[PDB]
């Protein structure tokens, strides 16, 4: 929805294309707060016995990745889908670094 | 108590009546590995049982799983079994599913548990006849009230007595783990009562007692006069053997390293003078200049060090240490000399033994590490006899190397300020660094923690908080977490020593693991040392923060 809004605004105004440039500015802070809340809740309710139902990793044919923290893969997918822009790469990289700063990880780690 | 101080001999006699045979092995001893006092007691028992030609076997064990498996392996032929260095704090019968009716005939077997930890399982004594221990003089006087409640707990208004008994039992429990007496001291008391004392036994008793100087100085100070009096009661010929009371200092290998390094690596001097930054080195140089020993002279071996200064070192220290406030470094120790070999002190010998234990030579790798540890224990045991000295010079040089490594890691920790000050307990994690593979040894981790807690105590902070230390073993992807008790400054009076500081980390860990399905492995004989998962460390940590310590 944000991408549609920014493209519509750019069109109404008239390897860079200002149709999309500047779309992550709409939801960065709410995303940061939501990621913080998710991390806190996962930290609190991961080793509980009755709350272990929703943290079970699904298994599907062709899967080969053994992973531990589901929130890491959530944010990794949410950032890799963003990283397909090929024109707003710097903004996406800055957002990815800010998200990774919530975890105690670094920018170029293999786990990230 | 089961076996009081005056009954030891009688129990010993029973052993003979059940073990003294011609062609049958009827005695097996299990020893708490990675412990010096247990090693000394085992050596004394081995000499005793080699005197009367009683056949025996010595088996090192590391974890409770090994204890259970080895006991399951044993045959009914073994009449007598010894458990030195552990077993006091847990109920063996529940652990070992012992049926008294299976071993009635009574006294089919006999298991003698000999441990020093003061909080011990009350049911283990007041419930079972098969299991028996040597009390140090605690059940008679301390437990005069708990035994009544246990005996009573072993018309509708009678629930008050049951409630009172339950409350008394709960009050007795929920106590921290401490040590109040020495196994080698108890064994030497038995030897003195029997009449087989000699110089080797006295030396082993001295080693066993002085092994506690780092952590249980109160016990050491309570026990020292007995050793002094016993040594008093008991031409340089190439076969002489001398045990004397010479002044000694809290110094690291004074007679085997240079005096400069001796002052540099000493934990007490480090704590008092802050040698991790440059002002400490400046103060040390001021100290040396004011004493008057040249910097080039102080950096030579103790053998070639100047004879006159070696003679007047006592007066130099007495006149110079007061200004810097190190007048607590001077104490009285034991020195052993044999012929023309040289002089060794008890502190130096125990440091050499500890370092030789440390360094020498998933589940599969853990088993390999544990068998390496038992092999190191056997090599350290072999190093005891007087016929080997290349197994002691190597230990001394390894002690020097290990102390260097510990200092190099601690200075980096104190630079980085990794010690996070929480509301209840301090915390520090060695996430990354050099030579971190050395710290897979719990005894090395305890050495590092002892230095850290001494440094923390020697400060202006007025907070006594437990410290948690953790490491990394990248091959297994597991954290090795050890809980550490706070310590008072060594220069303190006895009025503020009403009770030693207890350790609640074992209770906290067991409660958290019993109420939450964490992936830990609590099997070490030290109940305050656990192995936890890298992903499981944190939630666990918050749990420990939220649980009543």
UniProtKB/Swiss-Prot annotation, chain A:
- Quaternary structure per UniProt? DNA polymerase epsilon is a heterotetramer consisting of POL2, DPB2, DPB3 and DPB4.
Protein's name in the database? DNA polymerase epsilon catalytic subunit A
Top-level taxonomy: Eukaryota, Fungi, Dikarya, Ascomycota, Saccharomycotina
Question: Membrane spanning segments where?
Answer: none
Cellular location(s): Nucleus
Q: Which family does the UniProt entry place this protein in?
A: Belongs to the DNA polymerase type-B family.
Miscellaneous note, as given in the UniProt record, is:
In eukaryotes there are five DNA polymerases: alpha, beta, gamma, delta, and epsilon which are responsible for different reactions of DNA synthesis.
Organism field: Saccharomyces cerevisiae (strain ATCC 204508 / S288c) (Baker's yeast)
What biological function has been recorded for the protein in this entry? Catalytic component of the DNA polymerase epsilon complex which participates in chromosomal DNA replication. Required during synthesis of the leading DNA strands at the replication fork, binds at/or near replication origins and moves along DNA with the replication fork. Has 3'-5' proofreading exonuclease activity that corrects errors arising during DNA replication.
Encoding gene per record:
POL2
| Domain remark text | The DNA polymerase activity domain resides in the N-terminal half of the protein, while the C-terminus is necessary for complexing subunits B and C. The CysA-type zinc finger is required for PCNA-binding.
UniProtKB/Swiss-Prot annotation, chain B:
Recorded hits in InterPro entries, A to Z, give: CDC45
Keyword Transmembrane listed? The answer is no
Q: What is the lineage of its organism?
A: Eukaryota, Fungi, Dikarya, Ascomycota, Saccharomycotina
The extra comment attached to this record reads: Present with 1730 molecules/cell in log phase SD medium.
An example GO BP is: DNA replication initiation
CC terms in the record's Gene Ontology section? CMG complex; DNA replication preinitiation complex; nuclear replication fork; nucleus
Q: What UniProt keywords apply to this chain's record, in alphabetical order? A: Cell cycle, DNA replication, Nucleus, Phosphoprotein
| GO molecular function annotation | chromatin binding; DNA replication origin binding; single-stranded DNA binding
Q: Where in the cell is it found?
A: Nucleus
Name this polypeptide is given: Cell division control protein 45
Q: What is its main location?
A: nucleus
> What Pfam families would the database entry show?
CDC45 (PF02724)
Q: Which domain of life is it from?
A: Eukaryota
Q: What's its job?
A: Required for initiation of chromosomal DNA replication. Acts at the origin of replication. Also has a role in minichromosome maintenance.
The entry sums up its family as follows:
Belongs to the CDC45 family.
On assembly, the entry states: Assembles into a complex with MCM5/CDC46. Interacts with MCM10.
